[PDB]
Every structure is written in C-alpha cells, then in structure tokens.
C-alpha cells in the first residue's frame, strides 16, 4: 500500500507505485 516513495530510489517490492519513474530517483514522470 505505503510502496515506494518520491526519489525513493528504486526498491523491489516497493517498486514506488504507478506515478513516477525508476530513473536515478523515484521522481515524479520527468
């Protein structure tokens, strides 16, 4: 639910929910 996090680099569960990307952060679609 929490997953991943602005800039939060880029885990593998955590995979940061569908919003930004998987670059050097988790930033939003840059």
């Given at each position: 639910?929490?997953?991943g996090?602005?800039?939060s680099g880029?885990?593998?569960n955590?995979?940061?929910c569908?919003?930004?990307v998987c670059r050097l952060?988790?930033?939003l679609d840059w």
């Open positions: 639910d929490d997953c996090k602005l800039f880029c885990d593998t955590a995979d940061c569908e919003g930004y952060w988790c930033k």
